[PDB]
Amino acid sequence: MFNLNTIYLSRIFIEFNFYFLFFLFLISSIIFYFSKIISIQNLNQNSVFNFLKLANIFGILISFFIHIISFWFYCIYSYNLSLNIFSDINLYNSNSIELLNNSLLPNYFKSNITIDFFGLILLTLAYIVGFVSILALDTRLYWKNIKYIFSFTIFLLIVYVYVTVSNILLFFMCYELLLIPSFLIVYFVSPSRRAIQASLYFVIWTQLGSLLVLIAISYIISITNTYEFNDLKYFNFTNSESTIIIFLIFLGFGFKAPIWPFHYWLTKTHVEAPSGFSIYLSGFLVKTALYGFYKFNTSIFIDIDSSIFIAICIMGVVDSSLKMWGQTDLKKLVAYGTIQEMNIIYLAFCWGDSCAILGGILFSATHAFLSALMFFLVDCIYRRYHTRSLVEVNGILHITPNLGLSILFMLVFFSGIPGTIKFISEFYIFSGLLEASPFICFILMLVANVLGLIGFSKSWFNATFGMPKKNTKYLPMDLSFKESYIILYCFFFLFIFSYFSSIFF
Amino acid sequence: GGFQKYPIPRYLHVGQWIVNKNWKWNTFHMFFPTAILCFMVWRNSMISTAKPPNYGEYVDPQSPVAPKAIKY
Amino acid sequence: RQNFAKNITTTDIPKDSHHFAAKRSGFTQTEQAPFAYNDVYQYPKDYKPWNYNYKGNGVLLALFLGSAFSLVAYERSYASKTGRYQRKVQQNYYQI
Amino acid sequence: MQNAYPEITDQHREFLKKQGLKVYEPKPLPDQINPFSKTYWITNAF
Amino acid sequence: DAYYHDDTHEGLMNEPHGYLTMDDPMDLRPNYEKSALELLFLVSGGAILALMLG
Amino acid sequence: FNSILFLLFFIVNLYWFNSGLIFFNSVYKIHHDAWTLIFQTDSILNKLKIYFFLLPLYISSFIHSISTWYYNYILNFLLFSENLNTNTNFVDYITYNTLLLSKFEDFNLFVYIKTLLITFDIRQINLDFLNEYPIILLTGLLFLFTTIFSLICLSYLGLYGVFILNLASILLFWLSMLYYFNLIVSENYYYYISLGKWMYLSNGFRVSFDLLIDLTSISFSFLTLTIGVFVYIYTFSYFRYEPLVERLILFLNSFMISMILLVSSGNFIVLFLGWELIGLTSFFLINFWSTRVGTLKAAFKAFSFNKLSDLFLFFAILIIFSTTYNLDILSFNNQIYLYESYNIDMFYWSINLIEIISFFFISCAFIKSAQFGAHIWLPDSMEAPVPASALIHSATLVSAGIYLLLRLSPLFELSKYAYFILPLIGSVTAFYGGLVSAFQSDTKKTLAYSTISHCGFLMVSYSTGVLEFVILYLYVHGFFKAATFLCVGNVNRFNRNIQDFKRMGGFYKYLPFECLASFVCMINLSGLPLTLGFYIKHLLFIGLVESYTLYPLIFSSLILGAIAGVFYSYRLFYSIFFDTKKGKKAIYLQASRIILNSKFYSNTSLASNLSITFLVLISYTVILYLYCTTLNNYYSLSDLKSIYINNAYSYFYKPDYNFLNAVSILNWFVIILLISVIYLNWRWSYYYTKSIDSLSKFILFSFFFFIFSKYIL
Ligand SMILES: CCCCCCCCCCCCCCCCCC(=O)OC[C@H](COP(=O)([O-])OCC(O)COP(=O)([O-])OC[C@@H](COC(=O)CCCCCCCCCCCCCCCCC)OC(=O)CCCCCCCCCCCCCCCCC)OC(=O)CCCCCCCCCCCCCCCCC
Numbered sequence A: 001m002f003n004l005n006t007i008y009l010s011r012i013f014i015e016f017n018f019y020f021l022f023f024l025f026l027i028s029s030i031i032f033y034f035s036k037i038i039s040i041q042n043l044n045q046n047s048v049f050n051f052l053k054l055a056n057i058f059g060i061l062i063s064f065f066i067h068i069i070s071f072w073f074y075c076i077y078s079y080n081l082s083l084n085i086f087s088d089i090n091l092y093n094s095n096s097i098e099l100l101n102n103s104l105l106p107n108y109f110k111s112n113i114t115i116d117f118f119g120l121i122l123l124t125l126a127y128i129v130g131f132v133s134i135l136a137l138d139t140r141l142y143w144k145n146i147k148y149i150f151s152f153t154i155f156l157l158i159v160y161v162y163v164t165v166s167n168i169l170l171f172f173m174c175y176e177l178l179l180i181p182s183f184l185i186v187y188f189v190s191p192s193r194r195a196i197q198a199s200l201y202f203v204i205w206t207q208l209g210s211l212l213v214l215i216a217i218s219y220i221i222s223i224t225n226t227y228e229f230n231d232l233k234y235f236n237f238t239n240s241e242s243t244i245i246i247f248l249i250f251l252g253f254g255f256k257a258p259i260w261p262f263h264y265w266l267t268k269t270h271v272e273a274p275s276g277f278s279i280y281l282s283g284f285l286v287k288t289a290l291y292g293f294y295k296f297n298t299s300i301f302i303d304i305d306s307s308i309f310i311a312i313c314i315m316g317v318v319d320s321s322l323k324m325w326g327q328t329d330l331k332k333l334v335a336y337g338t339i340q341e342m343n344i345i346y347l348a349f350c351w352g353d354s355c356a357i358l359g360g361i362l363f364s365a366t367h368a369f370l371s372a373l374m375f376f377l378v379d380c381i382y383r384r385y386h387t388r389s390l391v392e393v394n395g396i397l398h399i400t401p402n403l404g405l406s407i408l409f410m411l412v413f414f415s416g417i418p419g420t421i422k423f424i425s426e427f428y429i430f431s432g433l434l435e436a437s438p439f440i441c442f443i444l445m446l447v448a449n450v451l452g453l454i455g456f457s458k459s460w461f462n463a464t465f466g467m468p469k470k471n472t473k474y475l476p477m478d479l480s481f482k483e484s485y486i487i488l489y490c491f492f493f494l495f496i497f498s499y500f501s502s503i504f505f
Numbered sequence B: 001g002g003f004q005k006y007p008i009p010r011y012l013h014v015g016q017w018i019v020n021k022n023w024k025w026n027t028f029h030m031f032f033p034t035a036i037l038c039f040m041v042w043r044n045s046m047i048s049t050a051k052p053p054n055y056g057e058y059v060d061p062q063s064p065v066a067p068k069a070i071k072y
Numbered sequence C: 001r002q003n004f005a006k007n008i009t010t011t012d013i014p015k016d017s018h019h020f021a022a023k024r025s026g027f028t029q030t031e032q033a034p035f036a037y038n039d040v041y042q043y044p045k046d047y048k049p050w051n052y053n054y055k056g057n058g059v060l061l062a063l064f065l066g067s068a069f070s071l072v073a074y075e076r077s078y079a080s081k082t083g084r085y086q087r088k089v090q091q092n093y094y095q096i
Numbered sequence D: 001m002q003n004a005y006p007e008i009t010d011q012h013r014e015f016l017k018k019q020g021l022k023v024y025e026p027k028p029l030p031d032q033i034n035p036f037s038k039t040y041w042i043t044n045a046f
Numbered sequence E: 001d002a003y004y005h006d007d008t009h010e011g012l013m014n015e016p017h018g019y020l021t022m023d024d025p026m027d028l029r030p031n032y033e034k035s036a037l038e039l040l041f042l043v044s045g046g047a048i049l050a051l052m053l054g
Numbered sequence F: 001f002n003s004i005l006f007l008l009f010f011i012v013n014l015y016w017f018n019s020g021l022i023f024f025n026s027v028y029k030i031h032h033d034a035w036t037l038i039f040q041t042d043s044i045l046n047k048l049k050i051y052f053f054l055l056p057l058y059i060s061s062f063i064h065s066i067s068t069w070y071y072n073y074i075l076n077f078l079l080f081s082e083n084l085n086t087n088t089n090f091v092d093y094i095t096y097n098t099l100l101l102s103k104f105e106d107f108n109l110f111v112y113i114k115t116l117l118i119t120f121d122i123r124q125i126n127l128d129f130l131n132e133y134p135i136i137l138l139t140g141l142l143f144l145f146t147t148i149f150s151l152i153c154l155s156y157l158g159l160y161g162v163f164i165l166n167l168a169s170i171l172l173f174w175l176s177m178l179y180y181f182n183l184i185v186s187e188n189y190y191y192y193i194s195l196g197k198w199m200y201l202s203n204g205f206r207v208s209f210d211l212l213i214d215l216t217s218i219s220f221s222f223l224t225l226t227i228g229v230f231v232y233i234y235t236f237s238y239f240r241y242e243p244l245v246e247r248l249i250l251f252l253n254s255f256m257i258s259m260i261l262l263v264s265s266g267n268f269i270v271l272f273l274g275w276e277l278i279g280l281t282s283f284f285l286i287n288f289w290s291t292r293v294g295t296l297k298a299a300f301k302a303f304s305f306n307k308l309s310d311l312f313l314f315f316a317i318l319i320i321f322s323t324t325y326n327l328d329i330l331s332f333n334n335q336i337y338l339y340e341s342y343n344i345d346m347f348y349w350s351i352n353l354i355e356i357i358s359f360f361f362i363s364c365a366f367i368k369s370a371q372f373g374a375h376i377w378l379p380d381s382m383e384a385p386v387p388a389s390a391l392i393h394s395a396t397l398v399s400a401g402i403y404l405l406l407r408l409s410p411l412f413e414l415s416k417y418a419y420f421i422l423p424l425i426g427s428v429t430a431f432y433g434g435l436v437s438a439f440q441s442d443t444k445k446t447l448a449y450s451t452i453s454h455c456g457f458l459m460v461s462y463s464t465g466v467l468e469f470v471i472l473y474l475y476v477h478g479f480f481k482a483a484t485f486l487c488v489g490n491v492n493r494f495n496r497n498i499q500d501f502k503r504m505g506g507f508y509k510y511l512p513f514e515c516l517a518s519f520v521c522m523i524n525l526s527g528l529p530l531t532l533g534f535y536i537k538h539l540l541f542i543g544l545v546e547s548y549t550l551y552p553l554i555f556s557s558l559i560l561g562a563i564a565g566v567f568y569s570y571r572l573f574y575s576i577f578f579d580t581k582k583g584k585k586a587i588y589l590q591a592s593r594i595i596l597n598s599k600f601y602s603n604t605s606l607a608s609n610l611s612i613t614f615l616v617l618i619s620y621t622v623i624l625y626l627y628c629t630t631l632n633n634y635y636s637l638s639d640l641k642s643i644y645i646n647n648a649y650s651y652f653y654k655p656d657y658n659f660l661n662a663v664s665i666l667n668w669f670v671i672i673l674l675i676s677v678i679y680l681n682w683r684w685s686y687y688y689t690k691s692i693d694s695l696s697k698f699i700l701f702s703f704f705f706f707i708f709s710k711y712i713l
């Protein structure tokens, strides 16, 4: 019963959501630039900053709704396309349907849009995490950094082009574009003074991997003049070229997606970055690297043993889990948890295009939401109690019961209880790893889910429980409606996304 | 027996020695709707409930309900 | 800091002007001057700070209408999948 | 799908019936449990 | 017990009190963060009901 | 505008419409297709007569047509689908449908109203319907949602509201469980319910949320629920005048429902969910005193052990799923024998699949049952309030391993590791716990170590392999441990949170009910002759196997643990109540004031006393029912779904002289130990010589009485 109307509606929605976002950004920027001689906030109720905040927030939200609709359309379209290809067996018949482009808006960068489930999951993560982070950075943007209110819209545009393009060069350029806005945010919006050095560490560490990926892309393009991302099927790389490409790609993308030993920059940036921008960083900016690695390694044929890469990922997991215990700083502890989860996700992609990709994608989604939750809780703790250290913070529950309850339920979700996408992803990864190498699976599970879990839970329990006798005049009240609903939405997604259609998982 | 009672701040939403005057109506309006919800859940779930045969019943091997092996 | 205007025109702020009274006679040479504004916020009676105090049916109506639409849409979709203009209800339904 | 248990004879079935056994038979959902039932929808409306 | 004090006479028995959240019940700011999050929740639920359920 | 006039007109219209419906039904039955010939006759007189005499029918049909038109328009608007069957114009459609009266052919207003009224009649429900469709799920959901919503809405439900709501829910749940207990245990009734497709766990797999109410599940479920009802009733008195009573009550309810879900789990995913839930809720109960960080240390210890057990259980479930592409408990039980011959290639050793799976299961079971080595958390878990301690230590937290073994018995029957490990560890734990409890000085610690010893005995019984004996032991231990825990909780509350009986003395008069209740509960719990708790140990020793290589150590440890019960029971009872007054003067003086003398005078709660009494009575009744079901000559227990027969019942039905005299050794050991704890003097007293004289009198009188009974008659 599938008809061409659904196909064209899916394509039109995907193409036009990008232009909706672009036009909203363009209009907001034009207003901001042409309303004032100097693009800074006027400290009065009639400032354009209120309008810009409104436009950004409710452009992101409306585009997120449209993205939900377009993602559902894509799911239907892809399922029916697979059915059309598979069902017909007559030799004379073949599925050759050609679609003609619309005459209303042009194809950005003269590229035909191609959409995949992983790309749309990444885009949805971008939308949600950007919404959370923009909601967080309101107290940080003040009177000289208001120009960074459009940073998340720029991120959304970049990610949209990144995930809706079938061109290797455009893919790489979109991947590389993410550095400037993030660095500017960390440099100009971070309150702490150590953020100045944290930004430089972030830039250098990420740019080393960017250079590695650039070398890999140069190898691919120079050897194969193609750029369509699909002509690589008709060209085979020799053993030496293939091993060089895979090594460069893995190391370069692991520089971004933290892997052992390249997580010093991640720890520094998470500790010294804005509480609202750390959410976006951990949730999304480390998964574009995973998506790029998946695309490139599945496009290229590799005839090398992945034991070294698996060992690197497992070593990173073990290192982070062991170090979890010794962190009295909640933000650094959450950063180590992010390192652990990212390393597990990366390990999920070490078997080419096998079924591990499904578990990797689900774990990426659950890790995004869980890291957003944890960093938001740390942000609330730091903002209401003027410290994020365990020694200075204790007995949160008895003065802010909602915050303590959120901490406890965050710990429960992090533990990986059944009924959560976290548990589902763990089940996928461990079920595969048991047959791949059962002893390695046992070691990984033991470490991560006992030693790292205990180290993680010690600090959070000690902070939540106790008796806050110190500084009674300065104690806070409770979570606000915004924070409470953000936490509730994170929990609701983590719980209900397990009912998503199992066709794609 | 118990600890001596001490004042609790009004602004703080905590359960220390909380007693509600309208607890009777609160219980009435929290019990019955929960019972209706669980009745709905139970009647929905009974559609997928399985029971073994009764005392005087035996399962015919050739009946459709009898287990069937996969046919290649 | 906050730069919004307190004095809104959408509605008049509830207030009580009798709790605090400004002295206007019998002053001394060491007493400070009184305060010009002495109005305090007055909450509506029966307001319970510990719950949402929501008395509207909009959310319930929206959720119920959404559920009813989902039900009818599923019925139509099942009919379409079965290739019928409407569901063909069977005489007996068994557990499954 | 094919029968998994070993087969039995109709004479054996008749013998069991004479002995007094009964053949297990699934029973239809009662009006209350059946979701396509006027009783079910009356309950929903109430 | 020997000297139990009734609730009507015990001055330290608490009735339900406290503020649910940190938001001011009487706030003159046209704040919209709560409205935005409520809209997000409602639209997510509506999309699930009207596109996915069944 | 009068209500009376409106009602009269409505009644008249109803009667007229009913009469018209009956007339039309008769005329249609007579004129199946020819009724229009008379109804729509061209004659104006006939047309007017029909319209006037069927006006209620015509107006009803007009309203129905309007409603159907609007409903069809709404559906078309919402679904972008088709037309109103056809594209008929509004006027044509409405006229046609109003003129058409065949819609009333089978409709009678009185019959329809009677059907609507009887739809909700409650006389129709029958025991046959209840047996066909269990309401256990309905009542369990009632309890669960009650607990959840009470937790969320604490302000709405004060202390009394929370108590009453949860009491009603739990009472309904317990009554339903009691009704189905008789059927499940004896009538061979078990149910497999499914709520839906919970989650996707593979490329095309999706595990459903299913529950299995079988004999194995019900044995734990009914015990836990019965203990929990009375623990709940008792808690409102134990935590009397405490700042947070609702929190404790809701935590207890949460733990109860978590354990019920664990025991009545239809698949390994639900089993793991219940495992984690019981771990988390036990952590919360232990850390109830959130303000103190000392309690947090014990809570974190228990949390660490629970997480280790979760790791082992998860790894075992992963192995099972990798071997068989299925997570159903019944399917695994009925398939494991096929794969028994398989092995798993690990790092450098080819481990037997059954052995490794059973190893992980037994490790998790020992961790959660507090066996030797992994029991370190149980003594520290006593920081919880006495109701929570009783619930966790009686049948809820420390029986998870026993439940796992019973449910997955077909796996362990083919496990070499289980055969070697269960008896040795069980006996060692029994001996260790028994001796430590005997030497213990604190009431809660003594009960905890006694619980450890009974867990060891349960492990040894399972090794023996008589599931009926294991179930009987579990029931007896749970009931009487809970009762003793409640009694000692009352004692501690009277003694002002001082749990050591070195400061307890002469409490018999101040807590009369507690003294006798503790006497009965302890004589039943500690295996003593002529008590309900003697038979569990007797059956354990009957079923003990002798092919073990470490049989000497196993048997010696079992004997020592069994005898250890007497010492701890005697010490606890005597020191708490009838020993010289050792406590602070204030404890006695504050209660001995003459002003307190009244009909209402009591140091405990009337509700507490009634709850303890009812718990003891119901425990006696249920234990007797189980004994009749299993140990009677006519075996009437339901199927256990196990094909392993141990032959242990042979020595219970037709014991030989060898075993009959062998049991006498343990009987006389217990007798000598009783004589020691009774007549042995450790302090100088005015009654030393008279006590020695009484011992001599008792010895000589016993000898003469035996002589007369056996020979002289
Ligand atoms: C302060 C919060 C702090 C949070 C931050 C911290 C977070 C972490 C820590 C957490 C713990 C601390 C906080 C807890 C204490 C809070 C204290 C407090 O605020 O107290 C006051 C708070 C509010 O009370 P109130 O102020 O007196 O009254 C509020 C207004 O009067 C109410 O007005 P109304 O009566 O008009 O209600 C409006 C609307 C309420 O509006 C909403 O809540 C909007 C919801 C939008 C959708 C969002 C997704 C929801 C996902 C499902 C969960 C439902 C929400 C319930 C809460 C979560 C569950 C506990 O009500 C409904 O109609 C309810 C139906 C909702 C169902 C919507 C389904 C959407 C589709 C979902 C996916 C598909 C499902 C398929 C199912 C198939 C069939 C089985 O106390 C409560 O009443 C607590 C309610 C708890 C939930 C139970 C009641 C709802 C049950 C719904 C049905 C489900 C049950 C079984 C169904 C079986 C048949 C299907």
Ligand SMILES: CCCCCCCCCCCCCCCCCC(=O)OC[C@H](COP(=O)([O-])OCC(O)COP(=O)([O-])OC[C@@H](COC(=O)CCCCCCCCCCCCCCCCC)OC(=O)CCCCCCCCCCCCCCCCC)OC(=O)CCCCCCCCCCCCCCCCC
Pocket: A409, A485, A488, A489, A491, A492, A495, C052, C054, C055, C056, C057, C058, C059, C061, C062, C063, C065, C066, C069, E035, E038, E041, E042, E043, E045, E046, E047, E049, E050, F152
């Ligand atoms: C293990 C972790 C556990 C964590 C959880 C622990 C427990 C937590 C407990 C505490 C928190 C949750 C429970 C309490 C939440 C608060 C409930 C509440 O009542 O609060 C009051 C809260 C505050 O009240 P407020 O300050 O007065 O604000 C009011 C709202 O702004 C606005 O209200 P309004 O009165 O102005 O009404 C607005 C309503 C407006 O409603 C209406 O307009 C409905 C009535 C009109 C019907 C249409 C008629 C048209 C023709 C005209 C007819 C004549 C006029 C009729 C109308 C007359 C007026 C009544 O508009 C909407 O709702 C728009 C929604 C539209 C999209 C979705 C629905 C439609 C779907 C598709 C429909 C298709 C078919 C229909 C086609 C229609 C034709 C095109 O209000 C609400 O309830 C708002 C809803 C959202 C509240 C927050 C939801 C949070 C939920 C959290 C869930 C967490 C789940 C986690 C699960 C974890 C599992 C592991």
Ligand SMILES: CCCCCCCCCCCCCCCCCC(=O)OC[C@H](COP(=O)([O-])OCC(O)COP(=O)([O-])OC[C@@H](COC(=O)CCCCCCCCCCCCCCCCC)OC(=O)CCCCCCCCCCCCCCCCC)OC(=O)CCCCCCCCCCCCCCCCC
Pocket: A067, A068, A069, A071, A072, A073, A124, A408, A409, A410, A412, A413, A417, A418, A419, A420, A492, A493, A495, A496, A497, A499, A500, A501, B041, B044, E044, E048, E052, E053, E054, F136, F137, F140, F141, F144, F195, F196, F197, F198, F199, F209, F211, F213, F221, F260, F261, F264, F277, F280
């Ligand atoms: C465009 C793409 C997207 C773009 C991005 C969009 C982003 C937007 C944001 C939102 C995210 C959207 C993502 C997409 C979502 C897709 C949804 C969708 O398609 O919907 C349709 C999806 C499938 O629909 P369908 O297949 O199309 O429908 C046709 C099928 O024929 C229907 O038939 P069916 O058979 O398939 O039915 C399915 C469902 C039908 O539903 C039912 O029948 C309702 C059953 C309700 C049962 C309630 C109680 C169960 C537990 C008690 C059990 C034992 C009781 C006592 C036993 C005593 C016996 C002795 O049945 C089940 O699944 C049964 C499962 C029952 C267990 C549920 C709870 C398990 C525990 C979970 C724990 C997780 C949180 C732990 C927290 C820990 C503390 C921090 O349906 C649903 O949405 C089902 C939702 C059901 C919700 C269940 C309520 C949860 C209760 C939680 C209780 C936990 C208590 C606390 C735990 C412990 C705390 C300490």
Ligand SMILES: CCCCCCCCCCCCCCCCCC(=O)OC[C@H](COP(=O)([O-])OCC[N+](C)(C)C)OC(=O)CCCCCCCCCCCCCCCCC
Pocket: A020, A023, A024, A027, A028, A054, A055, A056, A058, A059
């Ligand atoms: C060649 C064509 C070029 C087209 C250029 C487009 C020009 C855009 C100019 C924007 C001016 C914004 C201020 C207008 C005056 C507001 C007055 C006011 O507050 O009164 C309340 C009145 C009415 O309020 P109300 O109380 O009636 O609320 C209902 C609101 N509506 C009518 C929208 C349903 O005006 C508004 O509420 C309008 C709000 C405008 C700001 C919206 C911000 C969200 C993001 C969109 C911004 C626009 C970008 C383009 C669209 C998105 C991308 C496709």
Ligand SMILES: CCCCCCCCCCCCCCCCCC(=O)OC[C@H](COP(=O)([O-])OCC[N+](C)(C)C)OC(=O)CCCCCCCCCCCCCCCCC
Pocket: A212, A215, A239, A240, A243, A244, A247, A248, A251
């Ligand atoms: C981890 C180090 C610290 C972090 C920084 C990362 C730097 C290193 C990044 C990875 C580089 C690739 C290493 C693996 C190469 C595997 C293939 C190989 O060489 O095997 C012999 C290969 C494979 O041989 P083969 O035997 O498999 O098959 C071909 C055999 N013949 C030719 C005989 C037919 O042989 C060759 O053809 C030689 C290729 C050598 C290439 C070495 C230089 C690479 C230069 C580009 C990358 C530079 C990145 C620098 C970044 C900045 C550093 C500060």
Ligand SMILES: CCCCCCCCCCCCCCCCCC(=O)OC[C@H](COP(=O)([O-])OCC[N+](C)(C)C)OC(=O)CCCCCCCCCCCCCCCCC
Pocket: A397, A401, A402, A405, A408, B013, B014, B015, B016, F144, F148, F151, F152, F154, F247, F254, F255, F257, F258, F261, F277, F281, F284, F290
């Ligand atoms: C559709 C089907 C039904 C849908 C329902 C879904 C329900 C999902 C779960 C909801 C959990 C709600 C928790 C509310 C907690 C409120 C605060 C509280 O209790 O006090 C905190 C107490 C004290 O709170 P307080 O007194 O300071 O403050 C109370 C008032 N507030 C919070 C608003 C300020 O603090 C603590 O020490 C933390 C204790 C946390 C205990 C959590 C136990 C949960 C146990 C649940 C068991 C469920 C079993 C499920 C079995 C089946 C599984 C499939």
Ligand SMILES: CCCCCCCCCCCCCCCCCC(=O)OC[C@H](COP(=O)([O-])OCC[N+](C)(C)C)OC(=O)CCCCCCCCCCCCCCCCC
Pocket: F438, F439, F567, F568, F571, F575, F665, F666, F668, F669, F672, F673, F676, F677, F680, F682
């Ligand atoms: C050698 C023959 C073969 C068998 C080998 C085993 C020999 C017997 C070993 C018995 C060990 C008993 C240890 C009990 C420890 C109790 C500790 C306690 O709670 O405190 C003391 C409690 C008293 O507690 P109390 O609170 O009243 O006061 C304590 C006072 N202080 C601290 C000063 C000690 O009970 C006793 O005092 C009784 C124990 C001591 C007497 C033991 C007599 C043993 C008789 C053995 C008879 C054997 C019959 C033959 C067959 C045997 C084999 C089948």
Ligand SMILES: CCCCCCCCCCCCCCCC(=O)OC[C@H](COP(=O)(O)O)OC(=O)CCCCCCCCCCCCCCC
Pocket: B032, B035, B036, B039, D030, D031, D032, F119, F120, F121, F122, F123, F124, F125, F126, F129, F135, F172, F175, F176, F179
């Ligand atoms: C032996 C059990 C002892 C403990 C029982 C505790 C109570 C359990 C709950 C009652 C029984 C429910 C299952 C009924 C099964 C059934 O349909 O059984 C079938 C019968 C009808 O008979 P038939 O379907 O066989 O013809 O159902 C009815 O008669 C339905 C009438 C209502 C029954 C009670 C409903 C309870 C739910 C809440 C109602 C709230 C009303 C409004 C309040 C404001």
